[PDB]
């Protein structure tokens, strides 16, 4: 049995069945707890749930076909099954906190995409929206082990460790040495010879992050606010090693809105990028142009992290959830709409051994296993 708790913005019912638009305290989700979830993922005013059974459920704003339910205009107030995938066992849904398209990865390695088609980010050689999931044919001969989506581009990595990117080319986020939009998955040739094991994608003028099995972190794309982590603000269209993180044992990477986050095997959280509204967790709202340890979590072993647009969640090994960043809609879970300038214990979860967290644009999720 997996208990799921949700909070934050709920104007399009992206929290799946609660009353009120600003849920300021984590709230037990009856609908999502009943599904037996292995993953919850949050997009722009949207929530997706992958179950142990391998089904996918979606709720929230339906505009641009972002929920994959065969519609494109209203809201879906209660989690509904994406019945287009009911013949598959889905392992993971990838969606950006500010995104309107998503991908799903099956246990047998197939990738499906749906939602907003702009700039080719769905990977079907076109810019057309897909109101329902569609198999990415270009990946059919490839055994995908992981997926990620930004707001304007997408990525996938093979079991052998090759990285593919597609979607909007502008500002170098795809990593192919130019700024050209790619309407179909394209291998990142620079990283051949590294086994890439994880990738994260940003939004708007976006960065991309990748992690190798040697613990090397690479970044490319838009340079604004230092979110590439090599100082200053210059973008690049070629993957570059973030030297600061070498030897740190990074095991998880994420991209929020204009910022980047890494978690290490020893439990340390690093953040860098745009500082506005305290999304970085360092206590001030200044930008940070090379990775810096989140000092407010020092001595707390973090085992999982999630980023929204302007907020972050981190889970300790004892099941406690810390949040920092913006709180216009209650997504900090501190009972108010006051920003958390430093990581702050979320209320309402004591006795719930949280194992994983998730965020969407302005909303937050915690669940047990």
């Amino acid at each position: 049995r997996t208990k799921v708790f949700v909070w934050g913005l709920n104007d399009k019912d992206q929290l799946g069945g609660l009353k009120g638009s600003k849920i300021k305290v984590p709230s037990f989700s009856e609908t999502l707890s009943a599904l037996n979830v292995v993953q919850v993922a949050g997009g722009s005013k949207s929530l997706f749930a992958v179950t142990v059974e391998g089904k996918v459920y979606a709720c929230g704003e339906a505009t641009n076909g972002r929920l994959g339910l065969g519609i494109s205009s209203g809201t879906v107030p209660i989690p509904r099954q994406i019945t287009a995938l009911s013949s598959y066992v889905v392992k993971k849904v990838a969606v950006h906190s500010g995104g309107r398209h998503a991908t799903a990865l099956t246990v047998d390695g197939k990738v499906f995409s749906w939602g907003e088609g702009d700039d080719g980010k769905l990977g079907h050689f076109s810019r057309m929206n897909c109101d329902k999931p569609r198999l990415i044919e270009a990946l059919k001969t490839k055994r995908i082990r992981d997926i990620a989506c930004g707001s304007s581009h997408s990525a996938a990595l093979t079991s052998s460790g090759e990285l593919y990117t597609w979607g909007l080319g502008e500002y170098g986020r795809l990593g192919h040495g130019d700024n050209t939009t790619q309407l179909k998955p394209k291998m990142v040739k620079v990283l051949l010879g590294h086994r890439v094991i994880q990738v994260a994608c940003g939004s708007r003028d976006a960065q991309t992050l990748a992690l190798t099995d040697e613990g090397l972190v690479f970044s490319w794309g838009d340079g604004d606010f230092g979110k590439l982590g090599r100082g200053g603000s210059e973008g690049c269209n070629i993957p570059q090693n973030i030297e600061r993180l070498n030897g740190q044992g990074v095991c998880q990477i994420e991209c929020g809105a204009q910022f980047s986050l890494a978690l290490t095997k020893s439990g340390v959280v690093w953040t860098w990028g745009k500082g506005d509204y305290f999304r970085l967790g360092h206590g001030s709202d200044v930008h940070v142009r090379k990775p810096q340890v989140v000092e407010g979590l020092r001595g707390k072993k973090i085992v999982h992290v999630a980023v929204g647009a302007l907020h972050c969640l981190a889970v300790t090994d004892s099941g406690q959830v810390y949040a920092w960043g913006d709180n216009d809609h209650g997504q900090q879970g501190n009972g108010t709409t006051t920003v958390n300038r430093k990581p702050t214990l979320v209320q309402g979860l004591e006795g719930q051994k949280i194992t994983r967290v998730a965020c969407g644009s302005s909303h937050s999720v915690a669940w047990t296993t």
């Binding site: 913005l9 104007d11 399009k12 638009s21 600003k22 722009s44 005013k45 500010g98 939004s203 708007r204 809105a257 204009q258 506005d276 509204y277 647009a309 302007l310 913006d326 216009d328 809609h329 644009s361 302005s362």
Partner: peptide
């Protein structure tokens, strides 16, 4: 206004 902030449409 931050471009990545949601508006509460309720």
């Amino acid at each position: 206004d931050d471009d990545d902030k949601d508006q509460d449409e309720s």
